[PDB]
Design a protein around this ligand. Structure first.
Ligand SMILES: Cc1ccc(OCC(=O)N2CCOCC2)c(C)c1
Ligand SMILES: [Zn+2]
Length: 140
């Protein structure tokens, strides 16, 4: 689990969005596994705008922050499960790191701020959904 709280906005994995997220929907994309919803109180995170390929991500299934190198946002895919079983993936950055399905929502952070949240992974790969192209998150 996990969210980015940026202004009065909440960024979550689309597949973990709550009824309240859908009922207070700002924006969603199944091909990014991203969903953004409204908050009443302002949030304590800031968003990176950058092309950093180094950062640190939170891995709930090790209670550890790991420093990683990660790919630039691209089109990628997977192999059978049960909620989305395999799937492709627009704007998936990959790194070598331990990630299980429930590791989704952990933040990836570089020197410019929040980069993304854990979205996919497998066989010692962790995939992050980029939020760095989403400039509209900072204003309005
Ligand atoms: C962060 C993260 C997200 C998804 C993921 O795998 C779970 C899943 O989607 N499956 C598809 C591939 O086959 C295994 C089951 C993993 C390993 C990590
Ligand atoms: Zn950066």
């Amino acid at each position: 689990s996990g969210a980015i709280y940026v202004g009065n906005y909440r960024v979550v994995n689309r597949h973990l969005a709550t009824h309240n997220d859908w009922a207070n929907l700002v924006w969603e994309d199944s091909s990014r596994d991203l969903l953004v919803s409204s908050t009443t109180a302002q949030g304590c995170d800031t968003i990176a705008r950058c092309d950093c390929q180094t950062g640190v991500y939170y891995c709930s299934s090790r209670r550890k922050h790991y420093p990683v190198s990660f790919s630039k946002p691209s089109l990628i895919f997977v192999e059978a499960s049960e909620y989305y079983p395999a799937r492709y993936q627009s704007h998936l950055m990959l790194a070598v790191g331990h990630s299980e399905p429930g590791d989704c929502g952990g933040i990836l952070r570089c020197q410019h701020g929040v980069v993304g949240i854990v979205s996919t992974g497998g066989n010692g790969l962790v995939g992050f959904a980029d939020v760095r192209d989403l400039l509209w998150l900072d204003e309005e």
